[PDB]
């Protein structure tokens, strides 16, 4: 058999990957790059085999020929006798979150406010809200809609990076990896929690997992769910219990991609690795947990219960869905 080479985005992911590699007896080894796009390039060169991707990045990877292998499956909402690995994925709800105290703010008054995004090119942080905003404004000048933002991966001198904070030292402002304080789901929610932004584009789970003691992280440990509201597309504001009726979109779950020629090997190795290190895995929590990283969603989202098999051997367009692919394509016409 062959070893599988995972691609870690940034140094925190690299550290977790190295622990995984050690624990797996080098069945998995690590390549690292500074951004998700550069990891996608390492895979296209054959210098890494695989990584797990948000759906917007799956679109970039899929245009370049890489294929989905296994998808994240989180805790099911409904009763299922199906094993996690065989359960169909349900998608997650992209939402726009504001502070309840910022009382005039709705979907229809977002112009010139400050925004927090997971990163450019990700589903809930970018493709869904900016695709909606382009469409509703009739303008491609989405870089002039919010007065200032943190949108990791944008030009660091531009308004879209003005709120990003970089690392402990203030280096790497706006880089699209976990070194940037406001990167990703939890970074973008922290950007709103600290009132750096007026609105965060994240998903429903983010708000629940970082409030009401669900996180003990310093910035999160005192946040209360009732101090947030979701913005609905009809201009109303709801409590964060109502995400099923006040979301922007339903997103396809993050998923592992690989070259087509290494997908079956990558699949087999991952099914075995999650049996050792997954939720209830033989060696988790004793030795290593693949789907934990103290809330920082490194390599995989912390709320992943397993990686699940895909039905229909889907192409990337099948896995993302036609409507979403079409939405991304429309937005990318602007740049």
């Amino acid at each position: 058999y062959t070893r599988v080479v995972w691609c870690a985005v940034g140094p925190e992911e690299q550290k977790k990957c190295q622990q995984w590699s050690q624990q797996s007896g080098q069945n998995v080894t690590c390549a690292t790059a500074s951004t998700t796009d550069d990891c996608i390039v390492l895979v296209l060169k054959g210098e890494a085999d695989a990584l797990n991707l948000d759906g917007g990045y799956i679109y970039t990877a899929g245009k370049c020929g890489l294929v989905p292998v296994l998808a994240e499956n989180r805790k099911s909402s409904k009763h299922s006798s199906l094993d996690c690995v065989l359960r169909p994925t349900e998608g997650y709800l992209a939402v726009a979150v504001v502070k309840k105290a910022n009382e005039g703010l709705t979907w229809n008054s977002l112009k010139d406010k400050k925004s927090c995004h997971t990163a450019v090119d990700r589903t809930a942080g970018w493709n869904i809200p900016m695709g909606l905003i382009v469409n509703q404004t009739g303008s491609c000048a989405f870089d002039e809609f919010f007065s200032q933002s943190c949108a990791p991966g944008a030009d660091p001198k531009s308004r879209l990076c003005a709120l990003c904070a970089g690392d402990d030292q203030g280096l790497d402002k706006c880089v699209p990896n976990s070194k940037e304080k406001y990167y990703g789901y939890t970074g973008a929610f922290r950007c709103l929690a600290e009132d750096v932004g007026d609105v965060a584009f994240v998903k429903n789970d983010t708000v629940w997992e970082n409030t009401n003691g669900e996180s003990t992280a310093d910035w999160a440990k005192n946040l209360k769910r009732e101090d947030f509201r979701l913005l609905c597309l009809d201009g109303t504001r709801k409590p964060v219990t109502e995400a099923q009726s006040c979301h922007l979109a339903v997103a396809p779950n993050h998923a592992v991609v690989s070259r087509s020629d290494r997908a079956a090997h990558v699949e087999q190795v991952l099914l075995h690795q999650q049996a050792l290190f997954g939720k209830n895995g033989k060696n988790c929590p004793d030795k290593f947990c693949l789907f934990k990283s103290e809330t920082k969603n490194l390599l995989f989202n912390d709320n992943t219960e397993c990686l699940a098999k895909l039905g229909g051997r889907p192409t990337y367009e099948e896995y993302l869905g036609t409507e979403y692919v079409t939405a991304i394509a429309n937005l990318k016409k602007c740049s």
């Binding site: 796009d37 996608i40 390039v41 296209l44 970039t60 245009k63 370049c64 990318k332």
Partner: peptide, 6 residues
Amino acid sequence: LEACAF
């Protein structure tokens, strides 16, 4: 809506 971006 066609080629690889790299």
